[PDB]
Amino acid sequence: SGVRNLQKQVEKVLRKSAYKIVSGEAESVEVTPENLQDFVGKPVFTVERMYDVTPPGVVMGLAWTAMGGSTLFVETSLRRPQDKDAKGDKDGSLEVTGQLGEVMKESARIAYTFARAFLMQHAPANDYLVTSHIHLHVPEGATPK
Amino acid sequence: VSGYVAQEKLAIAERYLVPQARALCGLDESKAKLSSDVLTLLIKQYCRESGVRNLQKQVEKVLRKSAYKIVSGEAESVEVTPENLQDFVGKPVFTVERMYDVTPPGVVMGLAWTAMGGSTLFVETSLRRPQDKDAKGDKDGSLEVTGQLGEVMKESARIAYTFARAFLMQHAPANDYLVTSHIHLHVPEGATPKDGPSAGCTIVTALLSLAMGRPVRQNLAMTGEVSLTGKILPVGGIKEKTIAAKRAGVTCIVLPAENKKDFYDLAAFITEGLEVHFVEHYREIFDIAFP
Amino acid sequence: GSTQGKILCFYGPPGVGKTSIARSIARALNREYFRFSVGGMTDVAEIKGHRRTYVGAMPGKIIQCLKKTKTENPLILIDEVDKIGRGYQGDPSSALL
Amino acid sequence: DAIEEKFRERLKELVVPKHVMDVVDEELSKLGLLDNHSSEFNVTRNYLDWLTSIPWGKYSNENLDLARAQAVLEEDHYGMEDVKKRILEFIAVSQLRGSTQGKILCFYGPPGVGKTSIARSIARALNREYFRFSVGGMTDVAEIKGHRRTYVGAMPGKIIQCLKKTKTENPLILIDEVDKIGRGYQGDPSSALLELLDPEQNANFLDHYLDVPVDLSKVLFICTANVTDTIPEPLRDRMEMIN
Amino acid sequence: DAIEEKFRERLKELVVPKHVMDVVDEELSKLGLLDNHSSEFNVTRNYLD
Amino acid sequence: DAIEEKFRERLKELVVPKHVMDVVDEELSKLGLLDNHSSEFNVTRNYLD
Amino acid sequence: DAIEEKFRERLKELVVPKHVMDVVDEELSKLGLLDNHSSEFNVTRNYLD
Ligand SMILES: Nc1ncnc2c1ncn2[C@@H]1O[C@H](COP(=O)(O)OP(=O)(O)O)[C@@H](O)[C@H]1O
Numbered sequence A: 001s002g003v004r005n006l007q008k009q010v011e012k013v014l015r016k017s018a019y020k021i022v023s024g025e026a027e028s029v030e031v032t033p034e035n036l037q038d039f040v041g042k043p044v045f046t047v048e049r050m051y052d053v054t055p056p057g058v059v060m061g062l063a064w065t066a067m068g069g070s071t072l073f074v075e076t077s078l079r080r081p082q083d084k085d086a087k088g089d090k091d092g093s094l095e096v097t098g099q100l101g102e103v104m105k106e107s108a109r110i111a112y113t114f115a116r117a118f119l120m121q122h123a124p125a126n127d128y129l130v131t132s133h134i135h136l137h138v139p140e141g142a143t144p145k
Numbered sequence B: 001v002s003g004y005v006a007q008e009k010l011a012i013a014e015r016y017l018v019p020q021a022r023a024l025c026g027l028d029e030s031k032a033k034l035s036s037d038v039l040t041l042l043i044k045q046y047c048r049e050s051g052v053r054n055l056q057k058q059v060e061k062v063l064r065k066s067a068y069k070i071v072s073g074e075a076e077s078v079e080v081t082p083e084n085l086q087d088f089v090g091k092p093v094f095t096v097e098r099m100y101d102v103t104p105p106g107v108v109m110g111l112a113w114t115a116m117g118g119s120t121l122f123v124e125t126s127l128r129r130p131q132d133k134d135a136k137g138d139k140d141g142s143l144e145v146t147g148q149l150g151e152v153m154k155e156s157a158r159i160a161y162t163f164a165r166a167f168l169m170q171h172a173p174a175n176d177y178l179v180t181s182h183i184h185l186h187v188p189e190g191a192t193p194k195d196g197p198s199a200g201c202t203i204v205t206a207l208l209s210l211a212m213g214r215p216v217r218q219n220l221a222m223t224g225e226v227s228l229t230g231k232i233l234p235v236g237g238i239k240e241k242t243i244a245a246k247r248a249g250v251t252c253i254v255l256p257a258e259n260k261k262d263f264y265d266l267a268a269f270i271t272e273g274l275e276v277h278f279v280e281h282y283r284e285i286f287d288i289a290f291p
Numbered sequence C: 001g002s003t004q005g006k007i008l009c010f011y012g013p014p015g016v017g018k019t020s021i022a023r024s025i026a027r028a029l030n031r032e033y034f035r036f037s038v039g040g041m042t043d044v045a046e047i048k049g050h051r052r053t054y055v056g057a058m059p060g061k062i063i064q065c066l067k068k069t070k071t072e073n074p075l076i077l078i079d080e081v082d083k084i085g086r087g088y089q090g091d092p093s094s095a096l097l
Numbered sequence D: 001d002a003i004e005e006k007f008r009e010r011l012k013e014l015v016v017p018k019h020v021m022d023v024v025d026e027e028l029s030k031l032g033l034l035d036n037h038s039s040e041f042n043v044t045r046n047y048l049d050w051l052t053s054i055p056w057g058k059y060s061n062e063n064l065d066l067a068r069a070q071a072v073l074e075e076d077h078y079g080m081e082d083v084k085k086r087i088l089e090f091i092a093v094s095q096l097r098g099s100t101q102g103k104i105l106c107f108y109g110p111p112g113v114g115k116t117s118i119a120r121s122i123a124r125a126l127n128r129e130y131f132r133f134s135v136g137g138m139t140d141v142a143e144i145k146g147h148r149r150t151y152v153g154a155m156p157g158k159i160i161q162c163l164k165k166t167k168t169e170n171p172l173i174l175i176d177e178v179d180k181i182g183r184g185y186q187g188d189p190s191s192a193l194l195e196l197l198d199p200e201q202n203a204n205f206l207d208h209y210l211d212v213p214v215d216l217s218k219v220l221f222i223c224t225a226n227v228t229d230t231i232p233e234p235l236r237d238r239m240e241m242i243n
Numbered sequence E, F, G: 001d002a003i004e005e006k007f008r009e010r011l012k013e014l015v016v017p018k019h020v021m022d023v024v025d026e027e028l029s030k031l032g033l034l035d036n037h038s039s040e041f042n043v044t045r046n047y048l049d
């Protein structure tokens, strides 16, 4: 979000232009985009937004990190075969991960229980949540508040 | 500034290093010749370090022994020869670079951009409990990472683990080795934290080697960064990594497609004899390692 | 026009030849050379001397370089910045800025 | 100028470096500025003791025939022909390429193998002066480099005392138990040792207590560590590791 | 005058800043006011050098 | 008194609080008692500056 | 000299081991060099005690 890094780039381009002037060939450097990759090298970033199709169970989430803001993804997945027993009645315990702070732990359990309630209230025949274990990962970066 | 190729050290040391140490012992070339052959044997065997400091210690030692052979010893003109050499600098210490050669299943090479230079640290894994604890058993095959993990390396490890678990059912559903068994996994320390995740692409191939139990194809070093859905990500510091892979005799290598740029900046003589395979989605790599 | 200062940094595996290029530049430009290791240092007084009312005070290392090297524009070579002592006792690394 | 005169007739005998001569000249000018009874006069008069006491150019001459080294090692140490042949090659090569030459060396093995005993035996072989200096587990930098000399109770690092005691400019220092040196955040002496052990920068070593550069270039240092692996790489990579 | 004037011809070659000029000169004036015997004058003398 | 006099014309322009006025006055006199060469005179000199 | 000498008189009575004879001798020589005000003097005086 800051201008500091671009400030480094344009600096670099100019001083390389100085080298082309003081002894070099051109009496007047003229940067053009086709020219550019010479001076400042190959592109660094390209693949903005890691996932594009977002395979099930991954969602975008904005986060007001310590500097600027960044669009960190949240991800989840199964951790055991689900039908360990067709009659089994054991809570599908969650496992949170990603250098979690404890306040987030309480928030996580709240959101989990709301998921469990919404499903049986909506489509009772499905039972994926209450009958299976699940790992969930929140990337770090948000400031604690 | 970067490191130095094995051959590159020869052209350095014959000019900019040998005469200097010759001025340290005060001799002239007339009495203490050192052929190229002695130099190539030295650097190829006795010193595997990106810096030139270690070879500088060796050549010092050789010269000073020559000084002793002149002022009091027998010869008025020492003539080092490789057969002579073992006298002066003793017997060879290292030779068998890259310890395993048959690479028994579940061990894979992995490049690492350590704090100084780059080194071809291996990654290894193994069972920690009987596998058939219950034919009906439904317990998660919990992993146990080890090897001076930083916590960031722990999330990377768990991510790679889950992708392994998904890839098996995507490929060969009948096998269930991963989800039904405990596994210890060991990543040797040395990588600096910022590149820490870069080992991860190796990890998944480790596990899969253990799963079918078939060995990896020989000397196919790799690196990358896994995305939890089979996309691979750019890694940093490629030039050091490639030279470290060169020292170990690697004859193939696999990189994220996003770094197809930086690797080509390298001087052409540095890149001779490798056979790169850029890839982006993870499934690609699976077909360039096992079958 | 005139000569100009600028900061530069080199970094890489130890023993790649770094300091040697330093000196090669020093005899290239013809400026006088002066190494100054600071690895593991914590003495902010080295960057600033002492008050001269303190007992045993003498100006910081740099001034010794000016007295010895005799130029207004030498080529100082700070060494091993990575290991600068960044402690509670007055961080020299703040003093170097 | 009584103390100044005894140290000055001293100065006339031991051949001080001219740089250190003029530096003690300005320091002596300050001593003339300093009061006859001041406690700082006591600290700086005992500074003059530590500085003038140091030999500056006294040069113990070595034997250079290998034979006398043969005997004198055989006089006090049986067998172990590998270590003797190594020392024999050491003398044989230094004897060839003209002047004395430095190198650091280490011996290692189970305690009580005679390590220090051969150290002293070599010290009386070469005729260099002996001085043990244990560094196992040491942390403070005041015993290696010394104090600033402006601190209360300040004293110069151990080396200044070994030079004060041994009276030669080119002794055989024997640092002991290098492997377990305390490498902490409080100013790592083990890092500080590199200025001692740097082949070129030992020649102009200086320490905070007595500012004046010393010239250790003729010293033949020796260091003893029980195991070669624990020693940090920058220190370990220079010296040869005899066993 | 001896030390002061060898340093003064020193000063005459190098182009000192006027700030540093007046500083060295007033320090030289304090040398002249300070007695030669004082250890304070030895400190300012060492400083002048 | 020369140093104190440049100080006092200084102070004659800028208008000090009477508090710090009396403080500098007693320090000025305390300086004036002090020897022209004493180390503590140099300290109070630099301080009064 | 009083502390050193009462250590000396007891030395005349109790026969310290010859290694302790020497050690107490060099520490005794160290005692006179130190200031009574120095911090290390306290720990080394109590050490010799
Ligand atoms: N390209 C080179 N040309 C000449 N000497 C080199 C080169 N690369 C490395 N060296 C050698 O490496 C040694 C150490 O290099 P330098 O950077 O000056 O210190 P360090 O590498 O220890 O930081 C020197 O003795 C130097 O001769």
Ligand SMILES: Nc1ncnc2c1ncn2[C@@H]1O[C@H](COP(=O)(O)OP(=O)(O)O)[C@@H](O)[C@H]1O
Pocket (backbone or CB within 6 Å): D076, D077, D078, D079, D111, D112, D113, D114, D115, D116, D117, D118
């Ligand atoms: N070959 C040998 N000749 C003479 N003495 C030996 C020999 N081997 C071991 N020793 C004895 O071993 C002891 C160990 O002493 P020393 O080397 O001085 O210190 P350290 O205990 O560190 O090895 C000495 O008392 C010495 O006499």
